[PDB]
Symmetry: D2
Subunit: 282 residues, 4 copies
Amino acid sequence: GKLVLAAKITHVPSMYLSELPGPHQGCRQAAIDGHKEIGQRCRDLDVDTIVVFDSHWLVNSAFHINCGEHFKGIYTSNELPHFIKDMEFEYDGNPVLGQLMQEEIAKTGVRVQAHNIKSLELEYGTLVPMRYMNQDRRFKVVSVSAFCTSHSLQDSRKFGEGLIKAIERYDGNVAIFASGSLSHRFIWDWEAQRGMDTYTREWDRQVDKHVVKMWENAEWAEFCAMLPEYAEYCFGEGGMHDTAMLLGALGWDKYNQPAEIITPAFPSSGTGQINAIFPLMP
Amino acid sequence: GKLVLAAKITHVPSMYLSELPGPHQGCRQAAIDGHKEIGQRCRDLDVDTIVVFDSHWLVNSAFHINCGEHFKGIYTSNELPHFIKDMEFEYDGNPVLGQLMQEEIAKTGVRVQAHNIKSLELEYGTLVPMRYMNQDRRFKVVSVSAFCTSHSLQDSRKFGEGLIKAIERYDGNVAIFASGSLSHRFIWDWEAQRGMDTYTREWDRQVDKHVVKMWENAEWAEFCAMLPEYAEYCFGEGGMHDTAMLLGALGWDKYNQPAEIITPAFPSSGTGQINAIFPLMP
Amino acid sequence: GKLVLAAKITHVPSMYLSELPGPHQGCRQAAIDGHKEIGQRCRDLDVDTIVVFDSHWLVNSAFHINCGEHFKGIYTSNELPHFIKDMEFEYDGNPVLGQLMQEEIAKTGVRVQAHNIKSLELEYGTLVPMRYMNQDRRFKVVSVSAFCTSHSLQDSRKFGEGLIKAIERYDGNVAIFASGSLSHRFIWDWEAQRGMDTYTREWDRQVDKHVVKMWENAEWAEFCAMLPEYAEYCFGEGGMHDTAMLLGALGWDKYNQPAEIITPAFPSSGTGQINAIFPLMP
Amino acid sequence: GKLVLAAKITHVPSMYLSELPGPHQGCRQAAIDGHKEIGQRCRDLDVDTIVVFDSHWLVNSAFHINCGEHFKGIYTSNELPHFIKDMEFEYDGNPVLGQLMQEEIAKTGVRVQAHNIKSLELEYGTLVPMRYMNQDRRFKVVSVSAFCTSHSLQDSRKFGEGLIKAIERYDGNVAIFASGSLSHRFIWDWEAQRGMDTYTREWDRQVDKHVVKMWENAEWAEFCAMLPEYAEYCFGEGGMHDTAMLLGALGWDKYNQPAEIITPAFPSSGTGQINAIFPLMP
Ligand code: NA
Ligand code: NA
Ligand code: NA
Ligand code: NA
């Protein structure tokens, strides 16, 4: 098979808040537009399976693949129980791609497990893009744990490299999404006052503006070299393992295409958020 | 009503692994016996509700109370889903204690929300002690978010202080559990070969030994003063807000009782674990 | 009196190495010519006294001013004593400007001491610019301790604010130099082979490029807001107190003039170096 | 020749302040007593040369040995110029030991330079012990740069290992002093009011109390394993390279003798200070 689309996308809970009646209604319409645009490009390019690097799925040991056959349930947020509760979803899985991913990524030396368990539910980083892109179940979905507490960014790079080798063996077109953040120093509890549209630290705002310029200028050797420090000093969501998996799949320091910005970087509860297409190398 | 028991307890997933057939069967027998002993004292002291400060429940904004009327479901770990899956549980809740907690804690100036929502499920740091102590539904349970990413430890202190005032207004006896860790520098993914019974860093091993000595010697003024640095430099599970909520309920720097070590400190996947009773001030 | 010139300047030891016969002769010619250019503008503006914020002078308590009447001695580096040794110097001092500085800065509530002591010698961050600008003793010199181990950047801001008041009372024209670095993560001892013209970390290189862009675009409110994080995460030389003293004198977040880059940013032993004029507000 | 004594010693400026008339007179008498006791033991053991690991001598590149033939001068503090100024000293050097040290330490792979330069003056970490121990010039002195900004603690270990091989080739008895601190989080500038006899952070006080117990219990494998973290999280004076050089010479994780406490650990301007003899292995 073939990788046909790669993207970095936001999954902030304010996207669901934007759908609700209230003074926040429409506050994330541009972020939702970005998802729906990326979904349309996946339809245009005959994507049959989407792999999400989910920076909301926390793991301490190894890389985990949710390649469940079928995902059906009711989601309630443990962050915002009152507002995001009893949310229905139903999507088709791809156990076959999941097993190919396990086999090829395990050949790189990466510790990796594939799970086809009815009771292992999709995490939030995967449910959000699926809400806006896949309500008609046009796409199969496979999820990867990207909130990695005790892991090497070089192993997430290798996870992405092995993923390409899995796609080569799979009979279909695949899209990959890093579902997470730029900087993720969430706004302090004693500063709720300031609302959802500010950075906690000007520092994170400025580093995020520089990083977005690096993406637009295809400075990927330089970005890949500085990613450990960006992930540490800018409090990356899940340690920016989602960003590492995506760059791994694309060629790491050999990746050479300017990012196409879909949703310009915006603050959300003190964190940096963007939607961007990473064009494929020739 | 009355606070009658306070404890720091482990919830490591190796407790469930200890139950399973294999080379690790019985690897956490003494941790499980410590949970059972603490439960039995709860029975002896005519406890009707347990409040658990759950360091596995991640929140970014405010302190959240799960005071659902009824808890029933099937638990699958997203950390070790091959081993911890399809785990049945059913417990009774205490919405009345929950709303009192919200009333009294909000008067401290702390941001606090109480949830009585069917679909808001118990988190792992609450499920583990309920599994060993509460299978016969002797106790009502309330859960508090103690994985607090953007929160002051002085607000966790105030949460505990407000909780005492809520218990005073409640018609019955209450126990509180900080469900979490000492140091929580989880073992590196590339060091899986070392197994489950080691510390990641000798540094964490030695700081944890000093902290347990301080607890045993009632050095609570000194321990409270050093808690922000301990949480940072020894990678506390959820920032050690669970520890801060418990010490807040007990009197913070005026707490003067020697900790009773129910289960001696042990390493678990690189992290420090203990079961300890915190005797109440006369 | 009048502040007539402000600058950020490099004092790297490779400037002296550039003068010596060997394979590195001329390796810092442009940095030296930047010093000479800034010196000539001081001559043109009728500067009688230069105040240097010396990021090589380490202090643990309070801000110290060397306002000695006369400076004469022989300098041997304790960093590169094989190459920088027996270096003769002689300059005139300004005890009157020093006492005005102590008077006005103490009114801000900052802890400040002024020293007029024969045996208190000029530090390296002052000797280097005086070597290239002041060999004919055209200028009196005063030095300020800007390697501040335990100090608030808001107090370095207040030091600069007070200095403007001292200059207003002084009968003459004054120039101020922040003598120090951008990033100062010095190259690791085991990486000696890579030589003198590289950054230790791509991270430092890229943050430094963003910071120079901010300076060129007069984004001073943003730069001032991010300075505490920059100094911490990019290992600022002396904590970037030199930069803070200079921006304090210039108006801090109200400073609105684009920096004039006299010598483009260059790596030196892993660290970021620049010569820049900070034009004065009308 | 033979190593006959090893010690960790303080060099705090408050030792000189203790000698002066004022409310602080005698405030460091016990620290001075410790120096003079260690001096007397060096006389009793027929020491002819003292090597000091000087955590006040800052270097960015390589390890430097001050093995000048003769040291004579007047010292003025740039930390406290009013109180510590025009301090006379005169001591005999040992260029022969210095050259052996360079030869043997360079065989371990460590980058090391020996300097015999009249104008390269003794640093403060060396002048303080020499003031209290060597006013009659009974001992020759060699100084080593131990404020190492960019260096491996394993390289400081190898410097100590190589030093023993140098002493074996030298015709005399040698003593080694690590001249530095335990924790060195100097008291914040805005907390001057608290005086010189407090810790900045209870955290540093407690870690220092644990470390001193480890020394007294000969827990050297454990202490050596945690030293990188101690040096980082407790703000070690010069990064605790002085401590690593000493433990290097003594056997690192194979060292097995309980430290003899000469001056019990005491706070000085927020930092931890101790005088201790490290008995030689049989
Ligand atoms: Na948000
Ligand atoms: Na475990
Ligand atoms: Na240099
Ligand atoms: Na002192």
